[PDB]
Amino acid sequence: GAKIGLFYGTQTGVTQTIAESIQQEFGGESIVDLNDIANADASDLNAYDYLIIGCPTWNVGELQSDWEGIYDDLDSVNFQGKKVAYFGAGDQVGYSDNFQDAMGILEEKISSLGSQTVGYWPIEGYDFNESKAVRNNQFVGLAIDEDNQPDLTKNRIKTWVSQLKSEFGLAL
Amino acid sequence: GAKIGLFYGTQTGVTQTIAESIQQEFGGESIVDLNDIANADASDLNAYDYLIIGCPTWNVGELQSDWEGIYDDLDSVNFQGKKVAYFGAGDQVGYSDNFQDAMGILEEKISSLGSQTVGYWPIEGYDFNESKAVRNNQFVGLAIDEDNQPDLTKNRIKTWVSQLKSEFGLAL
């Protein structure tokens, strides 16, 4: 199949729209497989050397419901040697204290299981107080805010994907 | 030289003592090179496929002075393909809000430059409020607290090194 597997869970439909924009900026279905995490098992992640994990943060202290189900099954996946990128939708004004928290939670688990995180993203284009996805001044992945910065989403996705092509090692 | 290069900066001498315990639990000088960051250049890090970064957190908002000097030079090192582990001394009671912050700052920079973080460590053996080294419930590396948990240091180092041997891929 495709080199890159993109697994996402969606509540509003914003995550799925972002997933399809990412897939488009990479070159479409031939480069990136879209996989709704609701209809998958953890072992489906084994099928790709390059992964992209999409998960929103909409209620603080809570993973998106579908990811919470598969979270305790990640221990079975063989993440050694894989490169994993992350993205998520959020509201940096309404959730200024927990902006993209879910991105942090999943990256910590999956990185500690032996993967290599790629696709870090600068916080300076944003205005928020705290994020589990940030140690100092980078998110672990792409932060999208359709509520407060919708005009930036398209160029953010395009620029992040160019960065990922190099980091995945699939650019020319 | 040695497979593993250990680079550390020391203020009190606690970091250097920890560095020498780590080197001993790995098998001594034949397995792990000890390198005082004060007497090194960033490019010395190029010489090893496996790195261990030691840095304390003693004044919040501040890297250890020697690391701050070499920080802006890390961009030149070729971290692609390297595995990097982290450790640091701290005071989880006196600095409950910034426990092992420096570990977080360096790991974010060095991981984003293309390395693979190894050696994550559980927070449950500790009692603190916040750490830049923690997204959810793991430090990025070994937290030592000679002020408050000195009896645990030896077994913590021994257990962490056993974990690193597998993660580095240098165990049997």
What are the residue ranges spanned by the domains of chain A? 1-172
CB contact under 8 A, B138 and A108: yes
Measured between CA atoms, how close is B120 to chain A, in angstroms? 6
CB contact under 8 A, A117 and B117: yes
Tokens of B51: 């790195």
Q: Is residue A56 within 8 Å of A63, Cβ to Cβ?
A: no
Q: Where are the alpha helices (DSSP H) in chain A?
A: 14-26, 65-71, 101-112, 153-168
B101 CB contacts (<8 Å, ≥6 apart)?
A: B57, B60, B95, B131, B132, B133
A112, A117, A135 ranked by CB distance to B138: nearest: A112
3-state secondary structure of A112: helix
Q: Confirm or reject contact between B65 and chain A (CB < 8 A).
A: no
Q: Confirm or reject contact between A88 and chain B (CB < 8 A).
A: no
CB contact under 8 A, B111 and A120: yes
Q: Which experiment gave this structure?
A: X-ray
Q: Is residue B122 within 8 Å of B138, Cβ to Cβ?
A: yes
Q: Confirm or reject contact between A166 and chain B (CB < 8 A).
A: no
Q: Where are the alpha helices (DSSP H) in chain B?
A: 14-26, 65-71, 101-112, 153-168
Measured between CA atoms, how close is B72 to chain A, in angstroms? 15
Tokens of A5: 């597997």
CB contact under 8 A, B167 and A135: no
- Beta-strand ranges (E) seen in chain B are 4-8, 32-36, 50-54, 83-89, 116-117, 121-122, 138-139, 142-144
3-state secondary structure of A110: helix
Q: How far are the Cα atoms of A101, A106, A110, B6, B118 from residue A51, in angstroms, in the given order?
A: 19, 13, 11, 31, 19
Cα A128 from Cα A97, distance rounded (Å): 7
Cα A156 from Cα B3, distance rounded (Å): 40
CB contact under 8 A, B135 and A167: no
| DSSP β-ladder status, B121-122 and B138-139 | antiparallel
Q: Where are the alpha helices (DSSP H) in B79-129?
A: 101-112
Cα B73 from Cα B68, distance rounded (Å): 10
Cα B67 from Cα B72, distance rounded (Å): 9
Nearest CA in chain A to B107: A135
Tokens of A3: 């080199």
Resolution for this PDB entry, in angstroms: 2.1
Measured between CA atoms, how close is A102 to chain B, in angstroms? 10
Nearest CA in chain B to A135: B132
Cα B20 from Cα B33, distance rounded (Å): 10
Q: Confirm or reject contact between A122 and chain B (CB < 8 A).
A: no
Tokens of B100: 């092992």
Q: How far are the Cα atoms of B1, B22, B40, B84, B137 from residue B29, in angstroms, in the given order?
A: 10, 10, 18, 18, 33
CB contact under 8 A, B120 and A132: no
Q: Which helix (H) or strand (E) holds A52?
A: strand A50-54
